[PDB]
């Protein structure tokens, strides 16, 4: 019977739940890093559940879901991905209870996304909206969220760079979701984090020109989705391999064709030519390109066809497999096309001004070294995420697991008010909240069962007059030390586990 | 031995209650199922009564001994209330262990239940705190003995039993004394009777009857001879019986026993008592001499029962024949050997009306169970009725109150920053298993069942209606008339929670094994 699935489910339950605890050890920065041996047989030390999910993992199906548990929250808010694992085992406990209570996993499921809709309101009831139209508010808030987080040093510097690059991809007063889509994060090997800079036309890998103009203004950006190499009738060459004599006349053929298509390039014309890799091509004849930049066209060669897809959408240089697809049509018009070799190492074609869809925003990442480059990458991304957290979900809420302490007691009664056989469900549903700050209270160190009992009254009283406050890690107003989070990291965490549980509940 | 502590004995605690409670919760209430339980003696005992199940079991652990004894208090106190006080007491262990598994220290969780046991008995108080007298209560008493008599699944027409329990308890346990008194109730009955045949005989009915039908079958009012005097073999504490071995030894044995009993039956009749009830009653030889002197009189009586005819009849005591005087005699309103329609149940009533110091319920039934059926039926009725006769305080039961009690505390839990809210929650959370287990014995969804009432208790904000305790389809504690003494409703709580507490303060166990009864 579905008992065997329940067993399976229980076994999946058995797998997934102990896994969620391993991150509960890493819950919060007060939560502890976890040393991990890998196939290398070497230690791996992270407080990051998302990697601990990915890095060494069991492919058990319940465990398979839990990476996407965070990986959604990874891609949802970019943040709060520990919590979404820390929310998992809390119901997974309670769900087995109902299963142990004999509650039908549908009814179990059925009771939840139902009651989840409830909780988020009361959760949102706790919340304080900030101004998404105001750059500085968010520049204060996500910063305060960055201040609520570990990465500051560059994030401080990079909050304006984030929020501005965001504010530049903020058209709306709502500030929409602020897709990181329109953002191109580029790194340049030289420079410093001070030399990380927001650029309003795409900073492009390198540049490639033989006789091609070094920097062309008003650049018509070509793209080559067509093969510049003459057709391959033997190896790469329009010749066939037998003797010296017959091939040289069709060596003449390889000549003109590669030039003509190249001639045709500049004849419909471009100031710049996007060129993907020649492996991203069948083949591209350089003697054509030798003549193509000899036609004095600024060009880049060997760029990601996927970054091309980014380039196509952001600066409006559309995919071109044809001379005809060159007019100005699929060609983005780039006001200043130049590569900057400057500030130490690296060279990157930097579009300065363009004819571009949306507001095209690329940020250079320069750093004292590669590692210094590497470190600011989260700094923005962190900021960029808590931004795309809060701009996407307007209402801001404080962190520290308090809203869970706040929401549980209420949903327990809401369960009771809801009543019904599903009350016990929604009760157990409500009963998964404190678990996160519970382990978190240990993660800062405390007795949550002692501490959370009291905030729960505090959160019975002011609903937040206090909360586990990361430095304190204990009862005090978290709005006072400003440990803050957009509702997105919270809300985005809710549906996943529940649904994924709601999934595994129906799942045999 | 071994000191067994931590989860070790905490299991040995939580272990025993579960095996105990479940046969009780499957036997819980009328929907509770009737359990055949056979001894090592090979004897079938069908037990739907947890207390009888408790009387049938002794489960090995010290608490399982005490749980058998736990209900006996409220079984003596309240009658009904035997099964629920135990079955939930183990549920606290379920609650508590998980709570200790939550990391909450055992004495922490130990205390919060009692701490929350206030509202438990306190929320009950608000339902009916009422008080009525005998002729008033008799309607609530039969209405409660709709449930209490029917708790043994015998209430039908047995408002006879209820109404005789109405006037039985007030007699013995006065409404003003508010002290438990069943002592002057004289429990009496015989196999072979009927459920529908049951009597309250305000006087004392003695098994023995008139020594002859030729002698009158009526002794007049009063004039009963209360005596310890031999009319048959005396049977003292210790003497050995030697008989006669000879022909010349046989003859005189008949003459002497004739010569003394005549004078004794004379002197008794000469004393002026027309029923001689002798602590040492009559042989068959004393009967004919009793017929010679022509006096109505009684054969062998139990030793203390001649006192029971001294106390209950108001007759001033003569201990023995040697002291015979007309002043101190046994009393009777009317002396009749009474057959109730089943001659299998046949008693000589020594009838008390004016001064009755022992009221006698006479119960009947076709079998040993059927009397006992009616016995434990009415006796548990008797006690709730006693509780109600002193103060008539009821509630709408079967979990309808358990939910309503579960509201306040579990609510009041979070009102408190204190750790015991979890206990208070689990306290109010442990309450609702009764309608749950009832609905299971009632053969319904137990889980919605509780919440059906809380959906009500949302609407209601009071037990009145409830789920089905009788499986009859009307969801009521009200018009279904699940109505029981609010006293005993509070007796289960204080007994359950505070016993478990005393069980909980002890994880410290020195036994050769884990659970030792």
Is B447's CB within 8 Å of A413's CB? no
Is A409's CB within 8 Å of B458's CB? no
Q: Determine whether the annotation assigns residue B90 to a binding site.
A: no
Is B417's CB within 8 Å of A423's CB? no
Q: Which residues of B touch A456 (CB under 8 A)?
A: 414, 417, 421
Distance of alpha carbon B261 from alpha carbon A235, whole angstroms: 146
Buried b (16+ CB within 10 A) or exposed e, B488-516: bbbbbbbbbbebbbebbeebebebeebbe
Q: Please, are residues B421 and B140 in contact by the beta-carbon 8 Å criterion?
A: no
The burial of A293, by beta-carbon neighbours within 10 Å (0-12 exposed, 13-18 middle, 19 or more buried), is given as: buried
Q: Please, are residues A180 and A274 in contact by the beta-carbon 8 Å criterion?
A: no
Kind of pairing between the strands at B2-3 and B297-298: unpaired
Q: What is the DSSP letter of A472?
A: T
Identify the residue whose tokens are 């029981």. B484
Distance of alpha carbon B423 from alpha carbon B108, whole angstroms: 8
For B330, residues 6+ apart whose C-beta sits below 8 A from its C-beta are B222, B223, B224, B225, B226, B273, B275, B277, B309, B310, B313, B315, B350
Q: Please, are residues B336 and B290 in contact by the beta-carbon 8 Å criterion?
A: no
Q: Chain B residues within 8 A (CB-CB) of chain A? A: 102-104, 407, 410-411, 414-419, 421-422, 445, 447-448, 451, 454-455, 458
Q: Please, are residues B80 and B380 in contact by the beta-carbon 8 Å criterion?
A: yes
Torsion angle of alpha carbons B17, B18, B19, B21, nearest 10°? 80
Q: Which two tokens stand for residue B410?
A: 């579990």
Identify the residue whose tokens are 């949306």. A358
Which of the following is catalytic: A51, A82, A144, A412? A82
Kind of pairing between the strands at A272-275 and A298-299: parallel
Nearest to A27 by CA among A103, A94, A81, A107: A81
> How far does A454 lie from chain B, in Å, by closest CA?
4
Could you say which of B407, B414, B419 has the minimum Cβ distance to residue A409?
B414
Distance of alpha carbon A189 from alpha carbon A192, whole angstroms: 9
Q: Please, are residues B407 and B457 in contact by the beta-carbon 8 Å criterion?
A: yes
Q: What is the DSSP letter of A35?
A: E
Is B451's CB within 8 Å of A424's CB? yes
Q: Please, are residues A141 and A408 in contact by the beta-carbon 8 Å criterion?
A: no
Q: To which H or E segment does residue B45 belong?
A: strand B44-47
End-to-end CA distance of chain B: 15
Q: Which two tokens stand for residue A44?
A: 């791996």
Is A424's CB within 8 Å of B447's CB? yes
For A78, residues 6+ apart whose C-beta sits below 8 A from its C-beta are A180, A381, A382, A384, A385, A386, A388, A389
Q: What is the DSSP letter of B229?
A: -
Q: Determine whether the annotation assigns residue B484 to a binding site.
A: yes
Q: How many CB atoms lie within 10 A of CB A457?
A: 22
Buried b (16+ CB within 10 A) or exposed e, B369-402: ebbbbbbbbbbbbbbbbbbbbbbbbbbbbbbbbb
For A34, residues 6+ apart whose C-beta sits below 8 A from its C-beta are A22, A25, A26, A45, A46, A47, A52
Distance of alpha carbon B501 from alpha carbon A496, whole angstroms: 42
The burial of B97, by beta-carbon neighbours within 10 Å (0-12 exposed, 13-18 middle, 19 or more buried), is given as: middle
Nearest to B373 by CA among B149, B169, B183: B149
Q: How many CB atoms lie within 10 A of CB B269?
A: 19
Distance of alpha carbon A254 from alpha carbon A70, whole angstroms: 54
Helix axes B159-172, B368-390, angle to 10 degrees: 50
Kind of pairing between the strands at B275-278 and B297-298: parallel
Kind of pairing between the strands at B199-201 and B204-206: unpaired
Alpha helices in B274-329 (DSSP H): 284-292, 305-311
Distance of alpha carbon A108 from alpha carbon A91, whole angstroms: 10
Helix axes B433-441, B400-415, angle to 10 degrees: 150
Q: CA B484 → CA B79, B145, B159, B472, distances in Å?
A: 11, 9, 16, 19
SS3 of residue A90 by DSSP: helix
Q: What is the DSSP letter of A78?
A: S
Q: Please, are residues B177 and B148 in contact by the beta-carbon 8 Å criterion?
A: no
Distance of alpha carbon B38 from alpha carbon B26, whole angstroms: 17
Q: Which two tokens stand for residue A192?
A: 């410093």
Q: CA B383 → CA A77, B129, B402, B495, distances in Å?
A: 66, 17, 22, 17
Identify the residue whose tokens are 């987080």. A149
Residue of A nearest to B416 (CA): A457
Report chain A's C-alpha Rg in angstroms.
28
- State phi, psi for B67 to the nearest 5 degrees: -65, -45
Distance of alpha carbon A421 from alpha carbon A419, whole angstroms: 7
Q: What is the DSSP letter of B467?
A: S
| CA angle B223–B228–B229, rounded 5-degree value | 95
Could you say which of B411, B451, B455 has the minimum Cβ distance to residue A413?
B411
Nearest to A94 by CA among A345, A435, A327: A435
Could you say which of B419, B421, B448 has the minimum Cβ distance to residue A420?
B448
Q: Chain A residues within 8 A (CB-CB) of chain B? A: 101-103, 409, 412-413, 416-417, 419-424, 447, 449-450, 453-454, 456-458, 460
SS3 of residue B438 by DSSP: helix
SS3 of residue A292 by DSSP: helix
Q: Determine whether the annotation assigns residue B398 to a binding site.
A: yes
Q: Residue length, chain B? A: 517
Distance of alpha carbon B453 from alpha carbon B444, whole angstroms: 14
Per-residue H/E/C for A118-134: HHHHHHHHHCEECCCCC
Is B447's CB within 8 Å of A412's CB? no
Residue of A nearest to B452 (CA): A420
Distance of alpha carbon A22 from alpha carbon A33, whole angstroms: 10
Is B448's CB within 8 Å of A421's CB? yes
Distance of alpha carbon A11 from alpha carbon A99, whole angstroms: 13
Q: Which two tokens stand for residue B85?
A: 């006080």
- Please state whether A141 falls in left (phi above 0), alpha (psi between -120 and 50) or beta: alpha
- State phi, psi for B311 to the nearest 5 degrees: -70, -55
As beta bridge partners, residue B188 has B362
Distance of alpha carbon B150 from alpha carbon B154, whole angstroms: 5
Buried b (16+ CB within 10 A) or exposed e, B111-122: bbbbbbbebbbe
Could you say which of B407, B414, B419 has the minimum Cβ distance to residue A450?
B419
Distance of alpha carbon A163 from alpha carbon A388, whole angstroms: 10
Q: To which H or E segment does residue A188 belong?
A: strand A183-188
Q: Is B26 a catalytic residue?
A: no
Distance of alpha carbon B18 from alpha carbon A387, whole angstroms: 55
Q: Is the dihedral of CA B384, B390, B391, B392 positive or negative?
A: positive
Which of the following is catalytic: B23, B26, B47, B49? B49
**How many CA within 13 A on the CB side of residue B233?**
9
> How far does A23 lie from chain B, in Å, by closest CA?
19
Distance of alpha carbon A62 from alpha carbon A88, whole angstroms: 11
Identify the residue whose tokens are 């969780």. B109
For B255, residues 6+ apart whose C-beta sits below 8 A from its C-beta are none
Residue of B nearest to A439 (CA): B102
Q: Is B83 a catalytic residue?
A: yes
Is A450's CB within 8 Å of B102's CB? no
For A147, residues 6+ apart whose C-beta sits below 8 A from its C-beta are A482
Residue of A nearest to B432 (CA): A424
Identify the residue whose tokens are 């004819």. A355
Report how far Cα A68 is from the mean position of its chain's Cα atoms: 13
SS3 of residue B269 by DSSP: helix
Q: Which residues of A touch B445 (CB under 8 A)?
A: 421
Q: Determine whether the annotation assigns residue A148 to a binding site.
A: yes
Distance of alpha carbon A477 from alpha carbon A491, whole angstroms: 21
Distance of alpha carbon A281 from alpha carbon A206, whole angstroms: 18
Q: Please, are residues B363 and B205 in contact by the beta-carbon 8 Å criterion?
A: no
Report how far Cα B149 is from the mean position of its chain's Cα atoms: 12
Q: Please, are residues A383 and A178 in contact by the beta-carbon 8 Å criterion?
A: no
Q: What is the DSSP letter of B231?
A: B
- State phi, psi for A31 to the nearest 5 degrees: -60, 155
Kind of pairing between the strands at B275-278 and B224-227: parallel
Distance of alpha carbon B482 from alpha carbon B145, whole angstroms: 10
Q: Determine whether the annotation assigns residue A83 to a binding site.
A: yes
Q: Please, are residues A490 and A483 in contact by the beta-carbon 8 Å criterion?
A: no
Q: Determine whether the annotation assigns residue A109 to a binding site.
A: no
Q: What is the DSSP letter of A231?
A: P
Q: Please, are residues A331 and A270 in contact by the beta-carbon 8 Å criterion?
A: yes
Q: Which two tokens stand for residue B57?
A: 């079991």
SS3 of residue A306 by DSSP: helix
- Please state whether A123 falls in left (phi above 0), alpha (psi between -120 and 50) or beta: alpha
Q: Which residues of A touch B447 (CB under 8 A)?
A: 101-103, 421, 424
Q: How many CB atoms lie within 10 A of CB B327?
A: 8
Report chain B's C-alpha Rg in angstroms.
28
Nearest to B392 by CA among B400, B402, B384: B384
Q: Which residues of B touch A420 (CB under 8 A)?
A: 448, 451, 455
Nearest to B28 by CA among B76, B71, B61: B71
Is A419's CB within 8 Å of B454's CB? yes
Nearest to B206 by CA among B310, B106, B87, B60: B310
Could you say which of B104, B410, B445 has the minimum Cβ distance to residue A449?
B104
Is B410's CB within 8 Å of A417's CB? no
Distance of alpha carbon A424 from alpha carbon A412, whole angstroms: 9
Could you say which of A103, A423, A453 has the minimum Cβ distance to residue B417?
A453
Q: Determine whether the annotation assigns residue A229 to a binding site.
A: no
Q: Please, are residues A88 and A497 in contact by the beta-carbon 8 Å criterion?
A: yes
Q: To which H or E segment does residue A217 belong?
A: strand A216-224
For A278, residues 6+ apart whose C-beta sits below 8 A from its C-beta are A284, A301, A302
Q: What is the DSSP letter of B156?
A: T
Q: Which residues of B touch A453 (CB under 8 A)?
A: 417-419, 421-422
Alpha helices in B228-341 (DSSP H): 247-271, 284-292, 305-311
SS3 of residue B81 by DSSP: coil
- State phi, psi for A345 to the nearest 5 degrees: -90, 180
Q: Which two tokens stand for residue B387?
A: 């509780």
Buried b (16+ CB within 10 A) or exposed e, A112-139: beebbebbbebbbebbeebebeebeebb
Could you say which of B102, B103, B445 has the minimum Cβ distance to residue A421?
B445
> How far does A492 lie from chain B, in Å, by closest CA?
28
Q: Which two tokens stand for residue B486?
A: 């609010």
Nearest to A6 by CA among A95, A132, A77: A95
**How many CA within 13 A on the CB side of residue B425?**
20
Q: Residue length, chain A? A: 508
Distance of alpha carbon A254 from alpha carbon A234, whole angstroms: 12
Could you say which of A101, A409, A447 has the minimum Cβ distance to residue B447?
A101
Give the distance between the most distant pair of CA atoms in chain B. 97
Identify the residue whose tokens are 């960029």. A384
Per-residue H/E/C for B311-348: HCCCCCCCCEHHHCCCCCCECCCCEEEEECCCCCCEEE
Q: Please, are residues B321 and B228 in contact by the beta-carbon 8 Å criterion?
A: yes
Q: CA B75 → CA A2, B52, B85, B364, B434, distances in Å?
A: 45, 10, 10, 22, 18
Q: Which two tokens stand for residue A291?
A: 């003549």
SS3 of residue B219 by DSSP: strand
Beta strands in A251-352 (DSSP E): 272-275, 298-299, 332-340, 348-352
A vs B: CB pairs below 8 A:
52
- Count of H-run helices and E-run strands, chain B: 16, 15
Distance of alpha carbon A274 from alpha carbon A223, whole angstroms: 4
Residue of A nearest to B450 (CA): A421
Q: Which two tokens stand for residue B138?
A: 């008799």
Q: Is B111 a catalytic residue?
A: no
- Count of H-run helices and E-run strands, chain A: 19, 14
- State phi, psi for B449 to the nearest 5 degrees: -50, -55
Q: Is A382 a catalytic residue?
A: yes
The burial of B33, by beta-carbon neighbours within 10 Å (0-12 exposed, 13-18 middle, 19 or more buried), is given as: middle
End-to-end CA distance of chain A: 10
SS3 of residue B336 by DSSP: strand
Q: Determine whether the annotation assigns residue A268 to a binding site.
A: no
Q: Which residues of B touch A458 (CB under 8 A)?
A: 417
- Please state whether A251 falls in left (phi above 0), alpha (psi between -120 and 50) or beta: alpha
Distance of alpha carbon A22 from alpha carbon A12, whole angstroms: 16
Distance of alpha carbon B431 from alpha carbon B92, whole angstroms: 9
Alpha helices in A339-466 (DSSP H): 370-390, 402-418, 421-430, 435-444, 448-461
> How far does A488 lie from chain B, in Å, by closest CA?
28
Which of the following is catalytic: B26, B52, B82, B138? B82
Nearest to B142 by CA among B381, B362, B479: B381
Nearest to A65 by CA among A57, A75, A77, A55: A57
- Please state whether B461 falls in left (phi above 0), alpha (psi between -120 and 50) or beta: left
Identify the residue whose tokens are 């003494």. B485
Q: What is the DSSP letter of B42?
A: -
Helix axes A421-430, B446-460, angle to 10 degrees: 90
């Amino acid at each position: 019977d579905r008992d065997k699935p329940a067993q399976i489910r229980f076994s999946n339950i058995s797998a997934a739940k102990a896994v969620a605890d391993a991150i509960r050890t890493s819950l919060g920065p007060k939560g502890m890093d976890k040393m991990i041996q890998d196939g290398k047989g070497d230690v791996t030390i992270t407080n990051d559940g998302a990697t601990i999910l990915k890095q060494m993992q069991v492919l058990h199906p319940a465990a398979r879901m839990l990476v996407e548990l965070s990986k959604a929250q990874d891609i949802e808010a970019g943040d709060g991905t520990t919590s979404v694992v820390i929310i998992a085992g809390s119901l997974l406990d309670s769900c087995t209870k109902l299963l142990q209570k004999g509650i039908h996993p549908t009814i179990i499921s059925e009771s939840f996304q139902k009651a989840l809709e409830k909780g988020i309101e009361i959760l949102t009831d706790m919340s304080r909206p900030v101004e998404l139209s105001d750059r500085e508010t968010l520049l204060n808030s996500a910063t305060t969220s960055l201040n609520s987080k570990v990465v500051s040093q560059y994030s401080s510097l990079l909050s304006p760079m984030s929020v501005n690059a965001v504010m530049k991809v903020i058209d709306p007063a709502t500030a929409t979701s602020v897709d990181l889509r329109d953002i191109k994060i580029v790194k340049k090997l030289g420079g410093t984090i001070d030399d990380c800079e927001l650029v309003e036309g795409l900073v492009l890998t390198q540049k490639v020109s033989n006789s091609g103009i070094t920097r062309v203004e008003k650049a018509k950006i070509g793209l080559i989705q067509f093969c510049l190499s003459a057709p391959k009738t033997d190896m790469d060459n329009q010749i066939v391999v037998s003797d010296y004599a017959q091939m040289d006349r069709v060596l003449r053929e390889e000549r003109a064709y590669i030039l003509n298509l190249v001639k045709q390039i500049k004849k419909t014309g471009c100031n710049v030519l996007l060129i993907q890799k020649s492996i991203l091509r069948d083949a591209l004849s350089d003697l054509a390109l030798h003549f193509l930049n000899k036609m004095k066209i600024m060009v880049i060669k060997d760029i990601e066809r996927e970054d091309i897809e980014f380039i196509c959408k952001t600066i409006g240089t559309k995919p071109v497999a044809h001379i005809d697809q060159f007019t100005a049509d699929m060609l983005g018009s780039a006001e200043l096309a130049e590569e900057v070799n400057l500030n130490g190492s690296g060279k990157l074609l930097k579009i300065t001004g363009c004819a571009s869809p949306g507001k095209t925003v690329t940020i250079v990442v320069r750093g004292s070294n590669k590692l210094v480059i590497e470190e600011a990458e989260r700094s923005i991304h962190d900021a960029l995420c808590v931004i795309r957290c809060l701009v996407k979900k307007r209402a801001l809420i404080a962190g520290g697991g308090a809203p869970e302490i706040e929401l549980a007691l209420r949903l327990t009664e809401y369960s009771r008010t809801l009543s019904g056989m599903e009350s016990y469900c929604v009760r157990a549903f409500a009963d998964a909240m404190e678990v996160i700050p519970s382990t978190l209270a240990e993660n800062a160190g405390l007795n949550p069962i002692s501490t959370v009992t009291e905030l729960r009254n505090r959160h019975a009283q002011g609903e937040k007059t206090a909360g586990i406050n990361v430095r304190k890690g204990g009862i005090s107003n978290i709005l006072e030390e400003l440990v803050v989070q957009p509702l997105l990291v919270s809300v985005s965490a809710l549906t996943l586990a529940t649904e994924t549980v709601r999934s595994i509940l129906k799942i045999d | 031995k071994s000191r067994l502590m931590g989860l070790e004995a905490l299991k040995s605690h939580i272990m025993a209650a579960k095996a105990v409670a479940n046969t009780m919760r499957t036997s819980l209430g009328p929907n509770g199922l009737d359990k055949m339980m056979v001894d090592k003696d090979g004897d079938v005992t069908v037990t739907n009564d947890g207390a009888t199940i408790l009387s049938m079991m002794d489960v090995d652990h010290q608490i399982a001994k005490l749980m058998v004894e736990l209900s006996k208090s409220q079984d003596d106190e309240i009658g009904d209330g035997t099964t629920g006080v135990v079955v939930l007491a183990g549920a606290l262990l379920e609650e508590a262990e998980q709570l200790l598994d939550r990391g909450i220290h055992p004495i922490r969780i130990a205390d919060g239940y009692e701490q929350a046991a206030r509202v438990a008995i306190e929320h009950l108080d608000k339902i009916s705190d009422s008080v009525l007298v005998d002729i008033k209560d008799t309607e609530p008493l039969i209405q409660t003995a709709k449930t209490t008599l029917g708790s043994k699944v015998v209430n039908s027409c047995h408002r006879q039993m209820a109404e005789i329990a109405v006037n039985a308890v007030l007699t013995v346990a006065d409404m003003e004394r508010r002290d438990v008194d069943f002592e002057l109730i004289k429990v009496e009955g015989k196999v072979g009777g009927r459920l529908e045949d049951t009597k309250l005989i305000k006087g004392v009915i003695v098994d023995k009857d008139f020594s002859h039908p030729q002698m009158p079958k009526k002794v007049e009012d009063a004039k009963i001879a209360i005596l310890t005097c031999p009319f048959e073999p005396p049977k003292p504490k210790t003497k050995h019986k030697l008989d006669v071995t000879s022909v010349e030894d046989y003859k005189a044995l008949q003459k002497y026993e004739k010569e003394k009993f005549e004078e004794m039956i004379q002197q008794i009749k000469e004393t002026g008592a027309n029923l001689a009830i002798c602590q040492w009653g009559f042989d068959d030889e004393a009967n004919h001499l009793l017929l010679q002197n022509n006096l109505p009189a009684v054969r062998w009586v139990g030793g203390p029962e001649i006192e029971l005819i001294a106390i209950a009849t108001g007759g001033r005591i003569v201990p023995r024949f040697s002291e015979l005087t007309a002043e101190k005699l046994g009393f009777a309103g009317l002396v009749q050997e009474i057959s109730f329609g089943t001659t299998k149940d046949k008693m000589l009533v020594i009838e008390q009306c004016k001064n009755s110091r022992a009221v006698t319920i006479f119960i009947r039934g076709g079998n040993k169970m059927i009397i006992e059926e009616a016995k434990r039926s009415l006796h548990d009725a008797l006690c709730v009725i006693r509780n109600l006769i002193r103060d008539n305080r009821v509630v709408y039961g079967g979990g309808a109150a358990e939910i309503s009690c579960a509201l306040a505390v579990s609510q009041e839990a979070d009102k408190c920053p204190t750790l015991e809210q979890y206990a208070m929650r689990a306290f109010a959370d442990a309450l609702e298993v009764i309608p749950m287990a009832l609905s299971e014995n009632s053969g319904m969804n137990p889980i919605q069942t509780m919440t059906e009432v809380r959906a009500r208790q949302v609407k209601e904000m009071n037990p009145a209606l409830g789920i089905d305790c009788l499986h009859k389809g009307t969801n009521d504690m009200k018009q279904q008339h699940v109505i029981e003494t609010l006293i005993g409703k509070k007796q289960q709580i204080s007994l359950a929670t505070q016993m478990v507490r005393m069980i909980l303060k002890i994880d410290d166990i020195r036994k050769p094994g884990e659970s030792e009864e």
